[PDB]
Short mmCIF file of C-alpha atoms in Angstrom, two decimals:
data_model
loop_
_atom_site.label_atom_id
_atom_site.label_comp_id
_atom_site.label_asym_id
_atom_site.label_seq_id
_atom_site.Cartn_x
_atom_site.Cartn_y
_atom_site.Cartn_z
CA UNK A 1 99.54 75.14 107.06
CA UNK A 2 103.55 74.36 107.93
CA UNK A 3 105.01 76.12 110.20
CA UNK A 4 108.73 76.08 111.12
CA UNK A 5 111.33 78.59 113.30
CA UNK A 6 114.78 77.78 114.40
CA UNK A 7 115.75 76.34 117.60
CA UNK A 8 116.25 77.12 120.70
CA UNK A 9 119.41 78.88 121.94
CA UNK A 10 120.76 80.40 125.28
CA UNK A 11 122.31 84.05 125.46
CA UNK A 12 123.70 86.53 128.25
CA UNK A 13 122.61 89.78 128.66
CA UNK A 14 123.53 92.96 126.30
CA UNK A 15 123.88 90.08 123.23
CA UNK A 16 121.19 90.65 120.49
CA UNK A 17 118.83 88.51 118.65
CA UNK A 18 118.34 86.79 115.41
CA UNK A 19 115.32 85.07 115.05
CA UNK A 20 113.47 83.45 111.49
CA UNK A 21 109.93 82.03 111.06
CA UNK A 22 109.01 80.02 108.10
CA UNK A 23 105.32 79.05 106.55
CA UNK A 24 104.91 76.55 104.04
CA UNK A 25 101.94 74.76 102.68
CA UNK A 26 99.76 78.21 101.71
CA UNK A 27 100.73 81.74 99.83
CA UNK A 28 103.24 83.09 102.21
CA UNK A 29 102.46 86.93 101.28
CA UNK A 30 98.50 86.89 101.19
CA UNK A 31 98.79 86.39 105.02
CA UNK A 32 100.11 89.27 107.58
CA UNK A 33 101.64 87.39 110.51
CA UNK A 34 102.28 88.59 114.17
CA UNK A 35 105.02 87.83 116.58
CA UNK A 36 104.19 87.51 120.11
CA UNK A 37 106.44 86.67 123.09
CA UNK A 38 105.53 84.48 126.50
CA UNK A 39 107.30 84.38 129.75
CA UNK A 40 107.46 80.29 130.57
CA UNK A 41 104.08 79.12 132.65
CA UNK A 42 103.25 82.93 131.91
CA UNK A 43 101.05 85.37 130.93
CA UNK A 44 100.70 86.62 127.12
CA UNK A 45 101.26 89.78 125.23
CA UNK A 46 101.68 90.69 122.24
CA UNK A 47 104.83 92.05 120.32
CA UNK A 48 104.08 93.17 116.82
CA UNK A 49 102.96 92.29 113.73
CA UNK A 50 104.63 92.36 109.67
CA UNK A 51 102.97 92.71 106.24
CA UNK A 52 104.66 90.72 103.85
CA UNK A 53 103.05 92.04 100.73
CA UNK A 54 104.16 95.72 101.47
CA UNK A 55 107.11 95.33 104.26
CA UNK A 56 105.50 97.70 106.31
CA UNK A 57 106.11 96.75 110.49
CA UNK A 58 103.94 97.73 113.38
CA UNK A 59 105.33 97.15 117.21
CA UNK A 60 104.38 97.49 121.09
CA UNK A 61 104.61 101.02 121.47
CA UNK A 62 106.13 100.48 124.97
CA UNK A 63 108.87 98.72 122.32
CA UNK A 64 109.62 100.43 120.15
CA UNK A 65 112.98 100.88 118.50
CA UNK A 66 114.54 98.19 120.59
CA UNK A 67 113.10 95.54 118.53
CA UNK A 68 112.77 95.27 114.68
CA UNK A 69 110.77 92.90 112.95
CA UNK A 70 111.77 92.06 108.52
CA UNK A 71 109.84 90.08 105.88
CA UNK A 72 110.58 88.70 102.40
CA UNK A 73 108.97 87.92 99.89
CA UNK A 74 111.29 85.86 97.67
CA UNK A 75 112.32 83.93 99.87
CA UNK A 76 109.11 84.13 102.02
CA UNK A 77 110.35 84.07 105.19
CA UNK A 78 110.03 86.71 108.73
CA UNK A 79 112.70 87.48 111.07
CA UNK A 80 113.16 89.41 114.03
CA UNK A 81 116.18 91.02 115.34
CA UNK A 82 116.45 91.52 119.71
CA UNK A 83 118.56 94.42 120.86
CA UNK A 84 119.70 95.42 124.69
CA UNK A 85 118.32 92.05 126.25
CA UNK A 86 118.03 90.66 129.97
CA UNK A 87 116.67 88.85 132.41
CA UNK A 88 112.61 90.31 131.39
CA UNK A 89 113.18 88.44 127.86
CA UNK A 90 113.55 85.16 129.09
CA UNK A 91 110.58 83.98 127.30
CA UNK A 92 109.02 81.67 124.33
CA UNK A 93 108.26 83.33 120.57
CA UNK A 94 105.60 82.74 118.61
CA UNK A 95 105.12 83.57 115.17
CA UNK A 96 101.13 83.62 114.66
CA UNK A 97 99.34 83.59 110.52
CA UNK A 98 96.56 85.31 110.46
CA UNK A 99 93.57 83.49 107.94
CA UNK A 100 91.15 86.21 108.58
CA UNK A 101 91.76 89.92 109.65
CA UNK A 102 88.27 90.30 110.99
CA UNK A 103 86.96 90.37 114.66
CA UNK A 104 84.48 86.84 113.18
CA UNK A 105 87.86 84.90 113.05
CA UNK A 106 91.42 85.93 113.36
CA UNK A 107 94.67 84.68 114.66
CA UNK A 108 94.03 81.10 114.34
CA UNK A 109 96.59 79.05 112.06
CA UNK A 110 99.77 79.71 114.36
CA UNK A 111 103.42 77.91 115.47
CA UNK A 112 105.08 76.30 118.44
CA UNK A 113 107.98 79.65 118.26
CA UNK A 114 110.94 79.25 119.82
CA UNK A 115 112.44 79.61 123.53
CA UNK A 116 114.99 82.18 124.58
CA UNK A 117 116.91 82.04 127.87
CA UNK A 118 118.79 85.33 128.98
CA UNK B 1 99.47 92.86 133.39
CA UNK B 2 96.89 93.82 130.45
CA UNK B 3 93.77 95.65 130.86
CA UNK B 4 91.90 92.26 130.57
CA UNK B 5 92.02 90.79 133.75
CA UNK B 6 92.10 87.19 134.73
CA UNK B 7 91.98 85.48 138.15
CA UNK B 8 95.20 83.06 138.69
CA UNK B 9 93.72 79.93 138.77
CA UNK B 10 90.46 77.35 138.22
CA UNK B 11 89.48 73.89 139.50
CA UNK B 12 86.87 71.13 138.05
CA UNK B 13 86.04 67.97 139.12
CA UNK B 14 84.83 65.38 136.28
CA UNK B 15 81.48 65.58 134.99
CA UNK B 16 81.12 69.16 137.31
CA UNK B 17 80.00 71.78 134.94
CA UNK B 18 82.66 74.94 135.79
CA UNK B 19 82.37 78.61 134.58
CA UNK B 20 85.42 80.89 133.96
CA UNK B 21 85.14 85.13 133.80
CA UNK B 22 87.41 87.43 131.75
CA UNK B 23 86.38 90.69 131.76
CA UNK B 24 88.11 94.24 131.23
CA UNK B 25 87.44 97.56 130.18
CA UNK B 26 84.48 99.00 127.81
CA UNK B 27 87.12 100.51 125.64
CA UNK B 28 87.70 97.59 123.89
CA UNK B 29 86.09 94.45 125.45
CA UNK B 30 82.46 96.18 125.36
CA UNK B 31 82.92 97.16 121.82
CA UNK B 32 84.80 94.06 120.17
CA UNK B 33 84.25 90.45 120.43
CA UNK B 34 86.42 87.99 122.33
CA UNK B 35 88.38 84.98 121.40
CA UNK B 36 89.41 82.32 123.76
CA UNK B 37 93.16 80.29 123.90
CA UNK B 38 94.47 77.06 125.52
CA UNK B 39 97.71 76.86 126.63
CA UNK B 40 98.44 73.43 126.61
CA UNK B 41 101.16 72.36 129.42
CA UNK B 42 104.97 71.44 127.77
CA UNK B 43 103.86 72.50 124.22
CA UNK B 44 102.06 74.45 121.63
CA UNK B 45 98.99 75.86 122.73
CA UNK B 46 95.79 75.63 120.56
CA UNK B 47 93.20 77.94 119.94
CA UNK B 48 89.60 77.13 121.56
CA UNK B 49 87.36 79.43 120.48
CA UNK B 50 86.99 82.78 117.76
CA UNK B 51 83.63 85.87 118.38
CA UNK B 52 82.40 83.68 121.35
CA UNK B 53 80.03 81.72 119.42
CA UNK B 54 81.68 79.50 117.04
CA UNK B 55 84.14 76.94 116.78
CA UNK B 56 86.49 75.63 114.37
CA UNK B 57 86.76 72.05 112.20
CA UNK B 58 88.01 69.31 114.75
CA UNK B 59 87.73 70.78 117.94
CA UNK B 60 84.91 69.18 120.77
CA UNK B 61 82.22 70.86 121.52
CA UNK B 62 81.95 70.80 125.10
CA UNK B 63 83.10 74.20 125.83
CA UNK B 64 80.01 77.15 125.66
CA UNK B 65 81.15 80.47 125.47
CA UNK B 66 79.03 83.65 125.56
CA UNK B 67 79.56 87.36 125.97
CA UNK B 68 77.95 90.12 127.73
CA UNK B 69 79.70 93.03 128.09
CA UNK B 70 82.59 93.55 129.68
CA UNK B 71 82.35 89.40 131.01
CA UNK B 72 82.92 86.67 128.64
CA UNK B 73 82.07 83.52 130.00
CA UNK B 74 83.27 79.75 129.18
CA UNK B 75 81.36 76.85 130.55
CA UNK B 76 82.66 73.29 130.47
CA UNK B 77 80.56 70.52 131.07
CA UNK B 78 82.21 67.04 131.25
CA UNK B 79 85.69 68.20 131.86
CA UNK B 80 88.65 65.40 131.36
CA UNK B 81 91.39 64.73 132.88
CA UNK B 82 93.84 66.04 130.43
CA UNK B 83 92.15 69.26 130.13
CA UNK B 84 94.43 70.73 133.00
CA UNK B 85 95.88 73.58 131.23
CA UNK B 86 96.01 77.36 130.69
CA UNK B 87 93.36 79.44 129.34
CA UNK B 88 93.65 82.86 127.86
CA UNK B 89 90.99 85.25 126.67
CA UNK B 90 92.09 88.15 124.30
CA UNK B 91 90.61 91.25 122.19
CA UNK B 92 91.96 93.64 119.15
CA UNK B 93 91.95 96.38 121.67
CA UNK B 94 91.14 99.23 119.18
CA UNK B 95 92.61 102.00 121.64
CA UNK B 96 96.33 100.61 121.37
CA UNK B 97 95.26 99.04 117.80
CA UNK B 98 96.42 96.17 119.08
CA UNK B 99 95.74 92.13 120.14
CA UNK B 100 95.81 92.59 124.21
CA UNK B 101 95.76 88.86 126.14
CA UNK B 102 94.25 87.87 129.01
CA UNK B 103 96.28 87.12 132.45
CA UNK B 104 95.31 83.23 132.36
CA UNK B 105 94.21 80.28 134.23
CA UNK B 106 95.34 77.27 135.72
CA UNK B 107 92.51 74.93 134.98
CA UNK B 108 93.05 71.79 137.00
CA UNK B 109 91.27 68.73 136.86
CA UNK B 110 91.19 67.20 139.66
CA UNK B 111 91.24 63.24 140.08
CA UNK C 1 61.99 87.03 73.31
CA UNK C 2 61.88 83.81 75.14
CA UNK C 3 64.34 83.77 76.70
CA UNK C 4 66.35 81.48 76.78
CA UNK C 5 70.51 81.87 77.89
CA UNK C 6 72.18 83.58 81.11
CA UNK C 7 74.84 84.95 82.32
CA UNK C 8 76.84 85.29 85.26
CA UNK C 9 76.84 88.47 86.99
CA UNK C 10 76.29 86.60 90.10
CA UNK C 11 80.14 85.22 89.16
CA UNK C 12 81.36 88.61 89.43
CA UNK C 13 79.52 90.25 91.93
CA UNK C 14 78.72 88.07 94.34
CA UNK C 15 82.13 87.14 94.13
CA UNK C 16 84.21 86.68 97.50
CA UNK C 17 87.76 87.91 96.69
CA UNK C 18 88.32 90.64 94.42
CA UNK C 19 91.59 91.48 92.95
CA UNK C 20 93.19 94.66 94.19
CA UNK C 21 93.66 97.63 91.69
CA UNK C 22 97.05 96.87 90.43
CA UNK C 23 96.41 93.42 89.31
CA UNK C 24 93.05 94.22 88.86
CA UNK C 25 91.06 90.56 86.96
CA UNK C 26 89.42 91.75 84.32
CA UNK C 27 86.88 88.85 82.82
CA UNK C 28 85.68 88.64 78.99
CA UNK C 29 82.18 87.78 78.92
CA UNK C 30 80.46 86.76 75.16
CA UNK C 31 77.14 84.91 74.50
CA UNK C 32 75.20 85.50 77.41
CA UNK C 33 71.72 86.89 78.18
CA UNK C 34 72.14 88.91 80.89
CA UNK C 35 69.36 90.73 83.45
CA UNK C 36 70.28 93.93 85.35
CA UNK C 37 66.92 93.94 86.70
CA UNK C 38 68.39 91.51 89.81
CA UNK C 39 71.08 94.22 89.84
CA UNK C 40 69.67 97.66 89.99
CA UNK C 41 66.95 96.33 92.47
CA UNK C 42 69.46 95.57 94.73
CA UNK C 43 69.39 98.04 97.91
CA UNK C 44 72.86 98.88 98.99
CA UNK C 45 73.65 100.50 95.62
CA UNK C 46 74.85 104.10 96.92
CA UNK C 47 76.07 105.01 93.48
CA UNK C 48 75.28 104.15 90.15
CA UNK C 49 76.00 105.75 87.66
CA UNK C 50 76.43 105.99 83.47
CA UNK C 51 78.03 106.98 80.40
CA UNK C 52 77.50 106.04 77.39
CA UNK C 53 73.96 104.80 77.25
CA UNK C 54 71.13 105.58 80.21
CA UNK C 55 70.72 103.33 83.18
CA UNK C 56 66.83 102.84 82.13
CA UNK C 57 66.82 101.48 78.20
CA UNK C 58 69.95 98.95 79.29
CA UNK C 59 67.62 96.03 78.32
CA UNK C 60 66.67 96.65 75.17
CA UNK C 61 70.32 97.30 73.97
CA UNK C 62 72.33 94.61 72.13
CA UNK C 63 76.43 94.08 72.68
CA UNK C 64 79.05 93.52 70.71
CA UNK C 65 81.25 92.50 73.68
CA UNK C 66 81.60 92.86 77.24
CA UNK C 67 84.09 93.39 79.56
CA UNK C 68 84.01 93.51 83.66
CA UNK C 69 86.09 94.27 85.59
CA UNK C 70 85.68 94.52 89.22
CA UNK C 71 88.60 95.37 92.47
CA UNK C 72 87.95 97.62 95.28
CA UNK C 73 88.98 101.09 96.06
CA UNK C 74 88.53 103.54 99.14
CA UNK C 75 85.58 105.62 98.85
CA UNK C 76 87.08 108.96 98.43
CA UNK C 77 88.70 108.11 95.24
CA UNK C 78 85.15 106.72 94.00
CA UNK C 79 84.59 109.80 91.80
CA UNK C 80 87.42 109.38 90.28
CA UNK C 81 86.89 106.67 87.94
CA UNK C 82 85.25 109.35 85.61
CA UNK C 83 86.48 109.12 81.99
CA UNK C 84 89.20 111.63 81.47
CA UNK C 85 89.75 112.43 85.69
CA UNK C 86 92.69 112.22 86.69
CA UNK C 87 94.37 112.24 90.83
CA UNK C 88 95.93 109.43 91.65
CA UNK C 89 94.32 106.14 90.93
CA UNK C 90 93.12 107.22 87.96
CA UNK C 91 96.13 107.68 86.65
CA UNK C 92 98.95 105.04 88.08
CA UNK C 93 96.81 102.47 88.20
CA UNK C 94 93.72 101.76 86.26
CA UNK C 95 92.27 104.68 83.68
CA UNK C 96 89.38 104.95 81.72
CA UNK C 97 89.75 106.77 78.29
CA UNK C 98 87.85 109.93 76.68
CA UNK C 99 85.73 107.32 74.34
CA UNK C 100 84.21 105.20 76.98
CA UNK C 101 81.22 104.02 76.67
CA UNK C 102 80.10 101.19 79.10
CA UNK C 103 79.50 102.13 82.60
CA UNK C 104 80.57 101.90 86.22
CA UNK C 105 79.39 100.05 89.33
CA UNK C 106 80.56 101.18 93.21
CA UNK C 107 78.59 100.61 96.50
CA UNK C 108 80.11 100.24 100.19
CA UNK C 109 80.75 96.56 101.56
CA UNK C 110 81.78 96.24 104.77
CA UNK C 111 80.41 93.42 105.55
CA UNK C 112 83.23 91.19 104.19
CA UNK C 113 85.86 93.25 102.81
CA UNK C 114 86.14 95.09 105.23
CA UNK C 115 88.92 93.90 107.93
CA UNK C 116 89.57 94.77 111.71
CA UNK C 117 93.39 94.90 110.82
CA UNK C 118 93.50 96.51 107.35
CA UNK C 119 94.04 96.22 104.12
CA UNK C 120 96.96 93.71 103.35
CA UNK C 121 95.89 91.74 100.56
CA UNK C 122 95.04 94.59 98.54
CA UNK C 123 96.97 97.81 97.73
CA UNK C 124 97.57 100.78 95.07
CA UNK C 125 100.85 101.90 93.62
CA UNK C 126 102.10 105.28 94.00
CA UNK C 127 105.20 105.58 92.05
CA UNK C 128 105.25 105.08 87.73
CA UNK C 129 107.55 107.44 85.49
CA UNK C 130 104.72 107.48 82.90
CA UNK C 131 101.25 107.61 82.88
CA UNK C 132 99.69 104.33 81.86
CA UNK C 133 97.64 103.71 78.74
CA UNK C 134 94.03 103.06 79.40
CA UNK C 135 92.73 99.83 80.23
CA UNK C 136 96.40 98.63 80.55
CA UNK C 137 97.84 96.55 83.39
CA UNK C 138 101.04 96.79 85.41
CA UNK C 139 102.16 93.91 87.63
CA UNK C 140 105.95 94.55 87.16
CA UNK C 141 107.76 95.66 90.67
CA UNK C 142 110.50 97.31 89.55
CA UNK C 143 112.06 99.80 92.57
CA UNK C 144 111.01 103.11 91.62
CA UNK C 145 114.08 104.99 92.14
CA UNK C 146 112.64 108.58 93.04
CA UNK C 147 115.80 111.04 92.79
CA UNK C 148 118.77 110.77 90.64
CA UNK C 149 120.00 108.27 92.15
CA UNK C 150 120.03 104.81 90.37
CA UNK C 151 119.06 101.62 93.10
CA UNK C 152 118.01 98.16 92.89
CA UNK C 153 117.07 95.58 95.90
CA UNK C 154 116.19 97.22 99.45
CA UNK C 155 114.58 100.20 99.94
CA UNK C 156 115.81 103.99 101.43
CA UNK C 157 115.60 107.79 100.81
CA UNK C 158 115.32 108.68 96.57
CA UNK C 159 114.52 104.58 96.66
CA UNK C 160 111.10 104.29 97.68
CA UNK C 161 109.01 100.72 97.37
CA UNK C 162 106.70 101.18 94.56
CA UNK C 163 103.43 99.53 96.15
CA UNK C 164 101.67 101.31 99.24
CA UNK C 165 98.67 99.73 101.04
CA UNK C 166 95.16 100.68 102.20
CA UNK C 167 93.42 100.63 105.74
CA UNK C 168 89.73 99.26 105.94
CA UNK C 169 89.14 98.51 109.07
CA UNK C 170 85.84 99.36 110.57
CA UNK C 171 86.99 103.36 112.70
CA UNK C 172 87.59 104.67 109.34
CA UNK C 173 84.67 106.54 108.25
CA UNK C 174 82.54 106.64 105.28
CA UNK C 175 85.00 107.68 101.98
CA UNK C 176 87.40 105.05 103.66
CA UNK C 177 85.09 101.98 103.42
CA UNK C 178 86.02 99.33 101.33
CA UNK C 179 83.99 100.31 97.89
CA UNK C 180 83.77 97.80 95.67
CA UNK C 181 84.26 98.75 91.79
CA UNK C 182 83.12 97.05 88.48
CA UNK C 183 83.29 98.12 84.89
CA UNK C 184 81.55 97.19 82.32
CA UNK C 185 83.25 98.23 79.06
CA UNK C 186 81.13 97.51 75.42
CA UNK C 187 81.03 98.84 71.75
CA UNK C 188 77.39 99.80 71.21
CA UNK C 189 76.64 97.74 67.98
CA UNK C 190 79.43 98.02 65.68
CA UNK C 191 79.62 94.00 64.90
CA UNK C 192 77.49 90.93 65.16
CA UNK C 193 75.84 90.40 68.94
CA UNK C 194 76.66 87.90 70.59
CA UNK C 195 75.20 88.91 74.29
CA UNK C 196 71.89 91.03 74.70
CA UNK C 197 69.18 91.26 77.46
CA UNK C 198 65.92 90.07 77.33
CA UNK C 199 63.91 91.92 74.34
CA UNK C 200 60.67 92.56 76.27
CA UNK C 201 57.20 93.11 74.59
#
């Protein structure tokens, strides 16, 4: 697998995200793929998670709304978009492909996401 | 912060065998397997381990993990010096139908 | 009676991936001996049923040409791959006509295809303006605009995606396990045979 994001960038509080994750190398659609955020020298929790074949988004439900997370297909690419950030989002991104979606193996084949400073 | 908890922090000496705990609730840890993470320091972390009992292509072979229960438990046996890093333990927790992490360690290796 | 050739059913199903039903890889199979003796004495075989000819005298029967074709389906729809039913996947996205005359295949398998986060490789359409001929494809993803109202490119009310996907992850209960299907479609001896079982004596 290849995966790429874009790079890092610094915002202020009450701005609002745009964020992209690539794949290369494989079938970009086969494979669901989960974002999940990371304060720095943190813990980890999970955000949500995107189906490129269908479009269909699932999220935190303590987040919902406030974030949104898109998909294509033709171009084969993810984004997410922030809303109403501060301070609590100062935190990494990872964009995580899943190669098997059973409890054997799962969440393996994932990306160095990008850093966010509010 | 997650249902799985985590002590803060771990220490190992070199050729010490250590043991690290994660345990949480029978909701979804006694029902579903674990996997274990690395958080490498500065970069991007790595995966160690998937179900607790086998290990992908590449990766040593040092590290023993087993479940029982609510505890999962990783041993290390001949720990290096580079190995200081963060580990993670998560689990699809089936009640939020969800991944849920771990709070992490600090595994240090001391000199 | 020797016998001599084979065939493989253990291509199609022991296979590991199976095309979902929209797409669904159907697979031409001529000059082959084939044995369903390895197949019916399988155990996890919940449902097996047939049409045209019994399940008993299959191997003293002679082919013209055989067709299987095999994807996976939730367990509730299961009954309906009955010639001439109709619902909902028997009727947007694979159909079997009035003059069938092979026979059908399903049985639960959870032990692979089943997958703790769902079903996102396969899916079923929900949205067609006509009903398809049988034993026709459809790959084409054209927006199926729902009211009135023409659209093209993104989605929204009267514009609906055409493609909706399944759950099988392992909560869901039996009727929402993933069931695999295969069909075998034949004429019963109408031309020269070119695949037939082994003629026991």
């Amino acid at each position: 697998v290849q995966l790429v994001q874009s790079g890092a960038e610094v915002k202020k509080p009450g701005s609002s995200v745009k964020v992209s994750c690539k794949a290369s190398g494989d079938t970009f659609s086969s494979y669901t793929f989960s974002w999940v955020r990371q304060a720095p020298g943190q813990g980890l929790e999970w955000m949500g998670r995107s189906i490129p074949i269908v479009g269909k988004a699932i999220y935190a439900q303590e987040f919902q709304g406030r974030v949104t997370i898109s998909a294509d297909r033709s171009t084969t690419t993810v984004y997410m978009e922030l809303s109403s950030l501060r301070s609590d989002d100062t935190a990494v991104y990872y964009c995580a492909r899943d190669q098997s979606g059973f409890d054997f193996f799962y969440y393996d084949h994932w990306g160095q996401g990008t850093l966010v400073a509010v | 912060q997650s249902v799985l908890t985590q002590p803060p922090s771990a220490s190992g000496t070199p050729g010490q065998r250590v043991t690290i705990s994660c345990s949480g609730s029978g909701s979804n840890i006694g029902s579903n397997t674990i996997n274990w993470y690395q958080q490498l320091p500065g970069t991007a972390p790595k995966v160690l381990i998937y179900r607790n009992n086998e290990r992908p292509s590449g990766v040593p072979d040092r590290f023993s993990g087993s479940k029982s229960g609510t505890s999962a438990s990783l041993t290390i046996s001949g720990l290096q010096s580079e190995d200081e890093a963060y580990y993670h333990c998560a689990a699809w927790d089936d009640s939020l139908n969800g991944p849920v992490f771990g709070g992490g360690t600090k595994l240090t290796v001391l000199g | 009676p020797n016998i001599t050739n084979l065939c493989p059913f253990d291509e199609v199903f022991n296979a590991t991936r199976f095309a979902s039903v929209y797409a669904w890889n159907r697979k031409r199979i001529s000059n082959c001996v084939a044995d369903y003796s390895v197949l019916y004495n399988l155990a996890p075989f919940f449902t097996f049923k047939c049409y045209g000819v019994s399940p008993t005298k299959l191997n003293d029967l002679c082919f013209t040409n055989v067709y299987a074709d095999s994807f996976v389906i939730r367990g509730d729809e299961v009954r309906q791959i009955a010639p001439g039913q109709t619902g909902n996947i028997a009727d947007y996205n694979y159909k079997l006509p009035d003059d069938f005359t092979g026979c059908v295949i399903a049985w639960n398998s959870n032990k692979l295809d089943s997958k703790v986060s769902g079903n996102y490789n396969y899916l079923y359409r929900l949205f067609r303006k006509s009903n398809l001929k049988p034993f026709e494809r459809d790959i084409s993803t054209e927006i199926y605009q729902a009211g009135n109202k023409p659209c093209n490119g993104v989605a929204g009310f009267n514009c609906y995606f055409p493609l909706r996907s399944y759950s099988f992850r392992p909560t869901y209960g039996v009727g929402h396990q993933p069931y695999r299907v295969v069909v075998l479609s034949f004429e019963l001896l109408h031309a020269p045979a070119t695949v037939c079982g082994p003629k026991k004596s």
